[PDB]
Each structure stands twice: as C-alpha cells, then as structure tokens.
Design an enzyme around this catalytic site. Structure first.
Site, PDB file in Angstrom:
ATOM      1  N   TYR A 216       0.889  -1.178   0.000  1.00 19.82           N
ATOM      2  CA  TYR A 216       0.000   0.000   0.000  1.00 19.82           C
ATOM      3  C   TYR A 216       0.915   1.212   0.000  1.00 19.82           C
ATOM      4  CZ  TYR A 216      -4.301   2.710   1.129  1.00 19.82           C
ATOM      5  OH  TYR A 216      -5.401   3.559   1.138  1.00 19.82           O
TER       6      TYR A 216
ATOM      7  N   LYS B 292      -2.429   8.255   3.622  1.00 21.18           N
ATOM      8  CA  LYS B 292      -3.619   8.056   4.468  1.00 21.18           C
ATOM      9  C   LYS B 292      -3.390   8.512   5.927  1.00 21.18           C
ATOM     10  CE  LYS B 292      -6.670   6.572   1.544  1.00 21.18           C
ATOM     11  NZ  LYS B 292      -7.890   7.360   1.124  1.00 21.18           N
TER      12      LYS B 292
HETATM   13  N1  NAP Z   1     -11.749   0.245  -2.422  1.00 16.88           N
HETATM   14  C1  NAP Z   1     -11.116   0.030  -1.268  1.00 16.88           C
HETATM   15  O1  NAP Z   1     -10.803  -1.260  -0.849  1.00 16.88           O
HETATM   16  C2  NAP Z   1     -10.706   1.141  -0.325  1.00 16.88           C
HETATM   17  C3  NAP Z   1     -10.471   0.852   1.017  1.00 16.88           C
HETATM   18  C4  NAP Z   1     -10.311   1.878   1.935  1.00 16.88           C
HETATM   19  C5  NAP Z   1     -10.394   3.198   1.480  1.00 16.88           C
HETATM   20  N2  NAP Z   1     -10.633   3.477   0.164  1.00 16.88           N
HETATM   21  C6  NAP Z   1     -10.769   4.878  -0.268  1.00 16.88           C
HETATM   22  O2  NAP Z   1     -12.030   5.127  -0.826  1.00 16.88           O
HETATM   23  C7  NAP Z   1     -11.994   6.284  -1.638  1.00 16.88           C
HETATM   24  C8  NAP Z   1     -12.700   5.990  -2.962  1.00 16.88           C
HETATM   25  O3  NAP Z   1     -11.950   5.056  -3.727  1.00 16.88           O
HETATM   26  P1  NAP Z   1     -12.624   3.772  -4.409  1.00 16.88           P
HETATM   27  O4  NAP Z   1     -12.013   2.546  -3.830  1.00 16.88           O
HETATM   28  O5  NAP Z   1     -14.096   3.944  -4.449  1.00 16.88           O
HETATM   29  O6  NAP Z   1     -12.152   3.900  -5.932  1.00 16.88           O
HETATM   30  P2  NAP Z   1     -12.803   4.677  -7.175  1.00 16.88           P
HETATM   31  O7  NAP Z   1     -14.225   4.326  -7.458  1.00 16.88           O
HETATM   32  O8  NAP Z   1     -11.813   4.526  -8.257  1.00 16.88           O
HETATM   33  O9  NAP Z   1     -12.913   6.236  -6.800  1.00 16.88           O
HETATM   34  C9  NAP Z   1     -11.782   7.058  -6.601  1.00 16.88           C
HETATM   35  C10 NAP Z   1     -12.244   8.427  -7.029  1.00 16.88           C
HETATM   36  O10 NAP Z   1     -11.159   9.303  -6.895  1.00 16.88           O
HETATM   37  C11 NAP Z   1     -11.411  10.359  -7.794  1.00 16.88           C
HETATM   38  N3  NAP Z   1     -10.205  11.176  -7.986  1.00 16.88           N
HETATM   39  C12 NAP Z   1      -8.907  10.786  -8.127  1.00 16.88           C
HETATM   40  N4  NAP Z   1      -8.150  11.872  -8.381  1.00 16.88           N
HETATM   41  C13 NAP Z   1      -8.952  12.950  -8.405  1.00 16.88           C
HETATM   42  C14 NAP Z   1      -8.707  14.293  -8.668  1.00 16.88           C
HETATM   43  N5  NAP Z   1      -7.481  14.796  -8.877  1.00 16.88           N
HETATM   44  N6  NAP Z   1      -9.773  15.134  -8.572  1.00 16.88           N
HETATM   45  C15 NAP Z   1     -11.057  14.673  -8.371  1.00 16.88           C
HETATM   46  N7  NAP Z   1     -11.305  13.340  -8.171  1.00 16.88           N
HETATM   47  C16 NAP Z   1     -10.249  12.515  -8.195  1.00 16.88           C
HETATM   48  C17 NAP Z   1     -11.778   9.604  -9.069  1.00 16.88           C
HETATM   49  O11 NAP Z   1     -12.435  10.384 -10.051  1.00 16.88           O
HETATM   50  P3  NAP Z   1     -12.103  10.160 -11.625  1.00 16.88           P
HETATM   51  O12 NAP Z   1     -12.494   8.744 -11.929  1.00 16.88           O
HETATM   52  O13 NAP Z   1     -13.015  11.100 -12.347  1.00 16.88           O
HETATM   53  O14 NAP Z   1     -10.650  10.416 -11.971  1.00 16.88           O
HETATM   54  C18 NAP Z   1     -12.654   8.504  -8.493  1.00 16.88           C
HETATM   55  O15 NAP Z   1     -13.979   8.962  -8.539  1.00 16.88           O
HETATM   56  C19 NAP Z   1     -10.516   6.634  -1.772  1.00 16.88           C
HETATM   57  O16 NAP Z   1     -10.172   7.660  -0.885  1.00 16.88           O
HETATM   58  C20 NAP Z   1      -9.820   5.345  -1.360  1.00 16.88           C
HETATM   59  O17 NAP Z   1      -8.479   5.562  -0.951  1.00 16.88           O
HETATM   60  C21 NAP Z   1     -10.810   2.468  -0.734  1.00 16.88           C
HETATM   61  C1  P1F Z   2      -2.165  -3.913  -0.054  1.00 17.43           C
HETATM   62  C2  P1F Z   2      -3.483  -3.754   0.677  1.00 17.43           C
HETATM   63  C3  P1F Z   2      -4.628  -3.827  -0.315  1.00 17.43           C
HETATM   64  C4  P1F Z   2      -5.908  -3.280   0.324  1.00 17.43           C
HETATM   65  C5  P1F Z   2      -6.176  -1.910  -0.268  1.00 17.43           C
HETATM   66  C6  P1F Z   2      -7.620  -1.483  -0.061  1.00 17.43           C
HETATM   67  C7  P1F Z   2      -7.758  -0.205  -0.829  1.00 17.43           C
HETATM   68  C8  P1F Z   2      -8.120  -0.286  -2.172  1.00 17.43           C
HETATM   69  C9  P1F Z   2      -8.247   0.863  -2.937  1.00 17.43           C
HETATM   70  C10 P1F Z   2      -7.937   2.114  -2.408  1.00 17.43           C
HETATM   71  O1  P1F Z   2      -8.142   3.277  -3.117  1.00 17.43           O
HETATM   72  C11 P1F Z   2      -7.074   3.762  -3.790  1.00 17.43           C
HETATM   73  C12 P1F Z   2      -5.810   3.153  -3.732  1.00 17.43           C
HETATM   74  C13 P1F Z   2      -4.758   3.645  -4.483  1.00 17.43           C
HETATM   75  C14 P1F Z   2      -5.001   4.755  -5.292  1.00 17.43           C
HETATM   76  C15 P1F Z   2      -6.261   5.360  -5.354  1.00 17.43           C
HETATM   77  C16 P1F Z   2      -7.311   4.864  -4.592  1.00 17.43           C
HETATM   78  N1  P1F Z   2      -8.528   5.413  -4.641  1.00 17.43           N
HETATM   79  C17 P1F Z   2      -7.558   2.182  -1.067  1.00 17.43           C
HETATM   80  O2  P1F Z   2      -7.288   3.424  -0.604  1.00 17.43           O
HETATM   81  C18 P1F Z   2      -7.429   1.030  -0.260  1.00 17.43           C
END
Ligand code: NAP
Ligand code: P1F
Ligand code: NAP
Ligand code: NAP
Ligand code: NAP
Ligand code: P1F
Ligand code: P1F
Ligand code: P1F
Ligand code: GLU
Ligand code: GLU
Ligand code: GLU
Ligand code: GLU
Ligand code: GLU
Lengths: 255, 254, 254, 255
Positions: free
Chosen positions: D156, D163
């Site tokens: 990560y 984060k």
């Molecule tokens: N998925 C997981 O397992 C996980 C776990 C814990 C936390 N998170 C957090 O959850 C949040 C959402 O991520 P996600 O997993 O749902 O992935 P996601 O659907 O790909 O969404 C990430 C979003 O970030 C936006 N973004 C990136 N750069 C940007 C910029 N410069 N300006 C405006 N928007 C921007 C993207 O918009 P565009 O597509 O238009 O570029 C996209 O809508 C993130 O903060 C991520 O770190 C994810």
């Molecule tokens: C190695 C451990 C894997 C578990 C990761 C879970 C996760 C998945 C997606 C996440 O969202 C991003 C990660 C990187 C770059 C952009 C985003 N939104 C994110 O922030 C966290």
C-alpha cells in the site's frame, strides 16, 4: 435506524441522569422494546417512575447484580422466557470505591483493584456469554468507557485500569463472537453529570476543561451517547465491531 | 555501565525465562542483582543459573505477588540486606491453561480475576513497596505482549490482563513521576519459555513472525534484556509511561 | 559503546539543535560522526561546534533535502570519504511561519506540500541513498512530535507532516527490515530551538509540560541524544517501526 | 436517520462500484438532496446513468479536479448558487501512480509521493475550507481512509503515508472547525473491489485474508460504508468529531 420489532436489554439505569437513560429514551423513541436490569431497589423505584416517560407498554425489569454468576445467568434466562430473543445489550455498569478515585494510584489496595475489574470489566464477559444465548441470529453489544482507559487521567486511577481492561474485553469478545454475527463495541463518553460522577475527584474541573479545549467547545449529554448507541445497536453499523467511538466533542483527538 | 547500580529481578523460573536474559545483560553491564522467585524449583534453578553470572553473592527472596505481606516483607528485607535499589524488572504473569485456548467468552470470573491479580495488580503493590527503596528515584519495567493492544487468537484472558497492565504502567508513571521514578513496559515478541508452552497456538505465531515481521526473524531474551538495560539506566532518563516493542517490528504492520 | 561506528547526522543549525544533543552523546560514546547542513550559517556554526567534540576531523556535507541530486551526491561522496556507515540521525523539518498559527483550514497547497516534502518525503530518499552505505545493516532515526499523533493547537501543517513522517518510518521499517536496516522515531517534548521560535504558542506548551507531564519538567537535547544512542546501537536490536517518546511522559496522559 | 431537507455533496464517484456510490444510494434512500462532483468526463457519464437508480429528481453534477484550487473554489461557489447551503461533504478521493503501489516503498519518487499527498490528503483541507462557506450553521465532513494509514501494509506503500496524512488532516480540521459546529471524521473502509483497487498490488490476497481472519469472517461492501456515512453525516453523530470509524469486519482490532 427504525427499531420497531427490536428488543434491547439496558443494564445500569439508576436515575434520570444515568447515561443508560439517555440510551433508553433514544431507543424507545425509535420504536424498540426495552428490558432493564438494575442492582439496588432504589434503581428499580427510579425505573418505575421513568418508565412513565417512555412509550414502552410493559415494564420489563430485572434485578441483576453483576458480581453474581447466578444472578446474571438466571436473569438473562428469565429475560429470554418473558420476551424471547433479543437484538442487543447496552452495558452501562462500573463501580469503584471512593478512596480509589482520588489521591495516589500506587496506594490502591488489591481488593479495590479487583472490585473495579470485576464489576467494570468482567461483567461484560459473562453478560456476553449469557446474552449470546438469546441471539441465535446475531446481534449487538455495546459497553460504556472513558478516555481514562486509553491515557492516564489524574484521579480516575483504578477505574482507568478497569476501562483499559474493558476496552480489551470488547476487542476479545468481538473476535470471539464475530463468527456468530454478534458485534461488540464501546462508546467512550465525555464527562456527564451523573450520580457515579459525583464520586470521582476533579470531575468538575474536567467538565470545564472540555468546554475550553475540546473541538466542539462544549460538553456532551446522555441523549448524545444514546444516538451513537442507536447507531451501534442497529444495522446502520453492520460492518463495525471491536471499535471504540468517542462521543466526547472531539477531546480524544487533541492534546 | 551499571556498576554501583542495584536492580531487583522478579520472575526467573529457568534458563529460558525472559528475566534470565535481563539478568545476563545487567550482570554483564556490572549491576548488583537481587532476585525474587515463587516456586521452590525456581530457587534451585536460580542457584545453579547464578554460577553463570558475575554476582559475588546470592541475594534470593521468595515472593508470591498474591500476598501483600510477602511483597511488603520481601522488599523490606531487600532494603535491610542490600540498601537502596535503582529499579525493578517485573517479569511475572499467570492464567490457568484452559483460559489460553478456546472461546474467550467462556472465561470464568476466578480465571479472569486470577490473571488480573498476578499479571497486573502485582506491579502496583511492587511499585508501592519498591518506591521505599528509591528515595532519589529509579526505574520500573514490566513485560507485556501485543495481545494487550489487539485481540490475538487464544491469548484471551491474558490479553485483557495485559491491557490492564499497560494502563497500570501509565497510571504509575503519572503517579510516581514526581518522585523521579519512571515506569515503562517492554512489549516482547514471542519467545519459547516455560509459560509460553501453556498458550494455545504459540508455535504457529512464532513462525508467522519470521514470515511477516519487518526483521523476518524472531527475538530472544537477551534482546529484551538489552532494551531493559536502556529503560533501567539513565540513557532513558526522559522516558516514562512508554511501551517499547521488542518484536522484530511486528506491532507496526498489519 | 560506539567506537568503530560511523553515523551521519542531518540538521544541526546551532548549539541548540536537537541534532547537536545527538552529536554530543554519540561523540562521547566514541562514534565517528559525519554532518549534513543546508545553510551557509549552519556550516559556520558546525565548524565552531566541532571544537567541542572529540571528532578528529570535520566531515561536513551540504545537503538540501529538497534536491534529489544533492541527497544522492551527498551520500555517494560520504561513502567515498568514510566508507560504510552504521546509521543516520534525521533532524530536519520545515514549514512557513503562517502555517504554525491561526486556522489549519486556511493552509495553502504549496505550504502543505513544502512541509511534506522537507519534513517527511526527505526521509524516504535519505533512507534509499544511505541503504547503499549499509550493506550489513544499520539504524535510521527520525525526529517527530506528538502533534503528529494528535491535533495540537498551532502545530497545524507540521502535525500532518509528522503524521506522514511517522507512517514513513513504518513503511521504511517494513521495506528495509529484510536488509537488517532498522527505522524508528523519537517523539521529543518541546525544546527551545531556532525552529521552535516560529511555532505559535510554544512557551505555553513548554510551561504546561512542567505542570502536567508525569516528570513535571521539560526534557533537553541530550536526553533525545541518549535515546538516539540506544536506537542507533545494537542495544535496540529487535526494535523497528517504533516511536519512542522522550517527553517526560506527556504522551501517556490526558 | 431521516435526511429530508438535507443537502450533501459527494466527491469521487467513478462508476457503479465506487465506495462513494454506496454512500449515495444510502443517503438518497434517506431523503437527501445530492450534489455530485467528478474529475473525468467518463465519471460524469457513469454518474448520469447511475442517477436513474436514484430518487434524486435533479442531476447536480460538477467537474472538480482537486489538484486545482480554482476548480475547487469555483465548484463550491456554483453549488452554493444552485442549491443554497449544504449540510456536509463526503470525500471519496485518492490517487497514486501504479509505479508506486508495489515493490519497495523506499524507491518512491518525490513526484509520486507529493502527488499522493496532494490529491489524497491536501484536497480535504481545501474542500473543507470552501465547503465551510456553505455551512453557516454547521455541518459534517467525512473522508475515506484505510488501515494502511495506521500500520505498514505490504504494497500500500505511498498511499499508506498519504492516508496517515489524511487521518491527521481530519483531526486538525476537527480542532479548527469545531467552533463552527462543523464535525470532521473518517471511515476506515475494509478492502472493496473498485476501479482504483485494481491498481493495488496484492489486493486479492488481502480480501481473502479478511474472510479468514477478521472477527466477522467476511468482507464489507459499499453500502456498509454508506450506512456509517449516514450516521456521521446526520445528527445521530452529534458529539463525534476527529474520529476514525473502521468499517472492516473488526479486522483493525486484531493481530
Ligand atoms: N476500495 C477500497 O478497498 C478502499 C479501502 C479503503 C479506502 N478506500 C478509499 O475510498 C476512496 C474511494 O476510492 P474507491 O475505492 O471507491 O475507488 P474509485 O471508485 O476509483 O474512486 C476514486 C475516485 O477518486 C477520484 N479522484 C482521483 N483523483 C482525483 C482528482 N485529482 N480530482 C477529483 N477526483 C479525483 C476519481 O475520479 P475520476 O475517476 O473522475 O478520476 C474517483 O472517482 C478513496 O479515498 C480510497 O483511498 C478504498
Ligand atoms: C495492499 C493492501 C490492499 C488493500 C487496499 C484497499 C484499498 C483499495 C483501494 C484504495 O483506493 C485507492 C488506492 C490507491 C489509489 C487510489 C485509490 N482510490 C484504497 O485506498 C485502499
Ligand atoms: N458520567 C460520565 O462522565 C461517564 C463518562 C464516561 C463513561 N461513563 C460510564 O458510564 C457508565 C454509566 O455510569 P453513569 O455515569 O451513567 O453512572 P450511574 O448513573 O451511577 O450508573 C452506574 C450504574 O452502575 C450500576 N452498577 C454498579 N455496580 C453494579 C453491580 N455490581 N451490578 C449491577 N449494576 C451495577 C449501578 O446500579 P445501582 O445504582 O442499581 O447499584 C448504576 O445503575 C459506566 O460504565 C461509567 O464508567 C460515565
Ligand atoms: N515468552 C513470551 O513469548 C512472552 C511475550 C511477551 C510477554 N511475555 C511476558 O514475559 C513475562 C515472563 O514470562 P516468560 O515468558 O519469561 O515465562 P516464565 O519463564 O514462565 O516466567 C513467568 C514467571 O512468572 C512467575 N510467577 C507467576 N505467578 C507468580 C506469582 N504469583 N508470584 C511470583 N511469581 C509468579 C513464575 O514463577 P514460578 O514458576 O516460580 O511460579 C515465573 O517465574 C510474563 O509477564 C509474560 O506475560 C512473554
Ligand atoms: N524543538 C522541539 O520542541 C521539537 C520537538 C519535536 C520534534 N522536533 C523535530 O526535531 C527536528 C530538528 O528541529 P529542531 O527543533 O532541532 O530545530 P532546528 O535546530 O532549527 O533544526 C532544524 C533543521 O532542519 C534543517 N532543514 C530545514 N529545511 C531543510 C532542507 N530543505 N534541507 C536540509 N535541511 C533542512 C535546518 O537546516 P538549515 O538551518 O541549514 O536550514 C535545521 O538544521 C525537526 O524534525 C523538528 O520537527 C523538534
Ligand atoms: C478525573 C476524570 C474525571 C472525568 C470522569 C468522567 C466519568 C464520570 C463517571 C464515570 O462513571 C463511574 C466512575 C467511577 C465508578 C463508577 C462509575 N460508573 C466514569 O466512568 C467517567
Ligand atoms: C497466541 C499468542 C501466542 C504468543 C504468546 C506470547 C506469550 C508467551 C508467554 C507469555 O507469558 C505468559 C502467558 C500466559 C501465562 C503466564 C505467562 N507468563 C505471554 O504473556 C505471551
Ligand atoms: C504548538 C506546539 C508547541 C510545541 C512544538 C514542538 C516543536 C518545536 C519545533 C519543531 O520543529 C519545527 C517546527 C516547525 C518547522 C520546522 C521545525 N523544525 C517541532 O517539530 C515541534
Ligand atoms: N471533592 C474533590 C475531591 C476530594 C479531594 O480528594 O480533595 C473534588 O471533586 O475536587
Ligand atoms: N523567542 C525569543 C528569542 C530570544 C533569542 O533568541 O534571542 C524572543 O522572541 O525574544
Ligand atoms: N509570537 C506569539 C504570537 C502568537 C500568534 O499570534 O501566533 C507566539 O509565539 O505565541
Ligand atoms: N497485479 C498483481 C501485481 C503483483 C505485484 O504486486 O507486483 C497483483 O495485483 O497481485
Ligand atoms: N446533523 C446536522 C447538524 C450538523 C452537526 O451535526 O453538526 C447536519 O449534518 O446538518
């Protein structure tokens, strides 16, 4: 968070100022059926009077002193027979001797130390074990802690070590009962003027420091612990377990 | 360098005890050591292990930390025999074996309270009594495990006793700090000891450490001893209420 | 004892710098010492301060950690001049003064990124370059402040930079661990330094430490120095990804 | 909960699987007016199709790249003019180059590092600053984090350090905006299969490990993050600020 057709056991109402009465008014207003446990007959008399403020159509009241295995075991078993299965337990129980809530921690006696542990932390383990029998579908258990559990707060002394123990109890129960879909969590409340708070040295000056220093610049109340309890006890919090939510105007986050 | 320092070491049972690792390190640094033990076999084990050390005499006291009087009299006799001390290494814990495996929710009140008594409260009464032997300050170190911070499978009632110990350390540090007595903990990684045999699933955890911890190896008793030497000396003069993990970095990952 | 050890110390500006605390202690323990600086004025201060140390020669290197080229060339030159090193003390941070008071929510983008770059990113790149000079293992320590773990009035942009720095320590620990390179942090209590003069509300905090912290006194650079010696020697083998608070116990209370 | 006459801004929907769409379905179900912000023209396209599933009578869509102050400043001003005042912001935005989400953290480039900080942490600060002007009475801001900000999680890498920064940002914003009655908190989500998650090394291995090891023995989903968002965004969490609530099957609580 509509809670009709839920039933929760609330342990630890003593009067109108109890944190558990905060929880109770919130749950009651969301439509839950409520079961109360008490220790002292005075607490039952207060519950009878307070129950007139609530929408509950039935007083479900049970005397449980959590120092007694028998009383916990028989109490919950009996609950299960009068109301059947439950959705969750709110635990609002702690006790320490007044000597041990002021002056020097190093002077704490074995008996005082173990008394606070017994009532304030172990009660949760045996309550979970017994209440689990009434939750074959899963449910939610929430206990009340204080920041003194995570840092040394002058005067909180033996209770702070009991709350450390309680907060770990929550983590170990959460791991244990997870596979049974029973979530276990803690609310870390800010200082609230209750009967037990009267016994803690320096409580008044802490209340003031919260107003001056905490992010929201104000103290929290019982109904606000109640609102977070409603969240923890319901499906809104379905993926949340082993967690500790500080309802304390942000104070935990600053230094 | 710990010459003209005197330290009481509680909790040696055999050659593998974490406390014997502390002993060798302090002994090697030139400290004068006093030892406390519960069981008769540990006295015997101690008398033989002392032949490895530099100690020109055998200062041994039986103390069961379940008895106030033994802790009180113990430390009173240590004072009478040796003078003022510079610190205490606390290496004592207990829980019944059925409680170190299976379902935590099934823990008995007796078992829960036993573990609190021996594994947590003992530090408090030790600190109270040892304080009398430290009028110009000193240093108290207790031994904990990551299990006090996170729920670890099997560790169960000892995890809740350790969470209790770790807060006990904070409250003692606050209380005793004005007397210039510091109180800290060493969170040790898993090490094969007498007591470690009694914990459900210990071998699996040993191996996970090497696979997953930043250093990719396990720790030993001498590594706990080395950090003990730091905490018990003036090198840590500014440090109290602290919990130092000597665990190949495992605490910092997930 | 650190004879035949060699450490690089980054971020001495004058006699009050924390990193000079570190220098005296390591010097006293027999370490060979290399120093890095940014400002002309700091080199001048360093030349004078070496007259106080047993360093038989002055190893001074200009490294502005905003420049990759300077960190790469700096460390490569240090390798040609002294050989393999045993570790690095990082004592570098920076933010604009208007980001050390008022409302955090008003922090500019460039101000925020400036503080991250210098105060956190710089550790990642130092660790990469310095790794080259430790084929056999070593130790890297960065200096942090409790405002990276909690919101502290006025500390503002730097607290977010310290949160990021302390995570940097953990990821480096995890990454460099298999290489036998330990990475840790000292969380020092407030100390009157040149940089501390630009932080809103510094005197107030200094005074609250005396009143509220367990030891009821503030710490000084030499006590940081002392814990640094522990973290940079084999005394701390087995400790990595750790944050040790040298702050009179303030971190443990509330 | 019940969110009629509340208006929320949701930032960071890319498609049907975005965490932020979980958040949107839950709020929309609860009666909120929703305003949506996006970066890519593709996300706006998805947004327009996902709006047919929602009870929203009106599309309120705004292009905001949080790398640009002017787009943030102008975006919120226009939101202001179009919908009036708002009750809170859901921040669901992060970014790091693929280069940096695998292999060795120590090799991270300065530009990769600052890119992750700038989008994943600083964005929150400027959002909060601009959103405040639309919350004269108070409001609530929530950002999405992950456990790799509190511990080193293999792969990560640069995003872990971002984060951490974000989680500190939340505390410092809580302290700063508290007196305005603006609460600021984080949801630490467990691994969820999203577009962005596809670029993280070892993501499938972690999913599996959660099912094996986490107290609830299962993974969580977007709706579960939404439901905790509704808690944090509503009056139910009055009293709560500077908090990080793990929606992760209890995984954070175990080792
Ligand atoms: N998925 C997981 O397992 C996980 C776990 C814990 C936390 N998170 C957090 O959850 C949040 C959402 O991520 P996600 O997993 O749902 O992935 P996601 O659907 O790909 O969404 C990430 C979003 O970030 C936006 N973004 C990136 N750069 C940007 C910029 N410069 N300006 C405006 N928007 C921007 C993207 O918009 P565009 O597509 O238009 O570029 C996209 O809508 C993130 O903060 C991520 O770190 C994810
Ligand atoms: C190695 C451990 C894997 C578990 C990761 C879970 C996760 C998945 C997606 C996440 O969202 C991003 C990660 C990187 C770059 C952009 C985003 N939104 C994110 O922030 C966290
Ligand atoms: N007020 C605060 O600032 C504050 C802050 C953070 C956390 N808390 C926690 O909140 C919880 C509720 O306390 P409170 O402040 O609301 O005080 P309270 O009104 O005095 O309630 C405490 C309850 O503990 C019960 N209790 C004590 N020993 C018991 C036993 N052996 N068996 C059964 N019940 C027993 C009491 O029952 P009887 O009266 O019938 O004996 C009483 O109802 C406690 O866990 C406390 O630590 C309080
Ligand atoms: N080994 C590990 O992986 C590990 C990891 C982290 C922390 N720790 C901690 O390190 C400490 C030492 O344990 P160890 O692993 O070194 O095992 P150990 O050799 O079995 O030592 C345990 C000691 O506790 C003593 N003890 C138990 N009850 C006592 C009592 N009532 N009064 C006086 N002494 C009593 C035992 O004495 P008798 O045998 O004479 O009764 C024994 O000397 C413990 O606190 C443990 O929790 C161990
Ligand atoms: N004093 C405290 O209460 C306190 C508390 C906790 C932690 N800390 C930490 O301790 C460390 C040392 O600070 P200090 O209090 O000792 O203050 P200091 O003496 O003023 O030292 C700060 C150093 O940072 C260096 N630096 C700043 N930007 C640099 C850059 N771009 N490239 C290379 N070096 C740069 C400065 O060098 P130049 O003068 O050449 O620019 C200076 O030597 C910092 O990490 C600080 O955050 C301080
Ligand atoms: C120095 C610290 C002052 C602030 C204390 C706030 C508080 C108040 C009351 C509490 O409840 C108890 C405390 C002791 C014994 C029993 C109870 N229920 C309690 O657990 C916490
Ligand atoms: C699944 C967890 C395995 C790792 C356990 C490491 C360990 C080993 C020994 C410990 O010491 C005791 C444990 C129980 C009872 C007494 C003692 N001294 C102890 O406290 C911790
Ligand atoms: C309001 C908080 C009061 C206590 C601050 C303690 C302190 C003092 C100096 C520090 O060093 C810097 C601070 C800002 C910018 C650069 C540096 N080196 C620093 O990082 C921390
Ligand atoms: N009643 C005192 C504590 C009593 C004391 O020990 O002086 C207080 O609440 O401040
Ligand atoms: N902070 C001190 C500076 C003292 C000095 O460095 O001369 C002041 O403002 O007077
Ligand atoms: N020089 C003053 C000003 C306070 C401020 O306005 O930042 C201080 O250091 O506290
Ligand atoms: N796509 C691969 C990358 C492997 C790696 O981390 O390099 C994975 O997600 O497992
Ligand atoms: N809950 C209300 C009031 C704001 C607050 O809880 O601070 C809202 O989000 O509009």
């Amino acid at each position: 968070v509509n809670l009709e057709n839920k039933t929760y056991v609330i342990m630890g109402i003593a009067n109108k100022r109890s944190i558990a009465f905060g929880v109770a008014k919130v749950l009651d207003q969301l439509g839950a059926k409520l079961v109360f446990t008490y220790r002292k007959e005075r607490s039952r008399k207060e519950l009878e009077k307070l129950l007139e403020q609530l929408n509950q159509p039935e007083a479900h009241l049970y005397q449980i002193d959590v120092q007694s295995d028998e009383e916990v075991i028989n109490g919950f078993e009996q609950i299960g027979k009068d109301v059947g299965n439950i959705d969750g337990v709110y635990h609002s129980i702690a006790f320490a001797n007044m000597e041990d809530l002021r002056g020097r921690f190093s002077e704490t006696s074995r008996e005082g130390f173990l008394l606070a542990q017994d009532i304030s932390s172990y009660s949760l383990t045996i309550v979970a074990h017994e209440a689990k029998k009434l939750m074959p579908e899963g449910g939610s258990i929430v206990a009340t802690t204080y920041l003194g559990g995570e840092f040394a707060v002058q005067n909180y002394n033996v209770m702070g070590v009991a709350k450390a123990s309680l907060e770990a109890n929550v983590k170990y129960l959460a791991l244990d009962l997870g596979p049974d879909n029973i979530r276990v969590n803690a609310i870390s409340a800010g200082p609230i003027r209750t009967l037990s708070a009267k016994g803690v040295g320096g409580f008044n000056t802490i209340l003031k420091e919260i107003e001056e220093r905490a992010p929201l610049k104000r103290n929290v109340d019982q109904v606000e612990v109640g609102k977070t309890a409603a969240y923890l006890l319901s499906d809104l919090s379905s993926g949340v377990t082993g967690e500790n939510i500080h309802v304390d105007s942000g104070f935990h986050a600053i230094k």
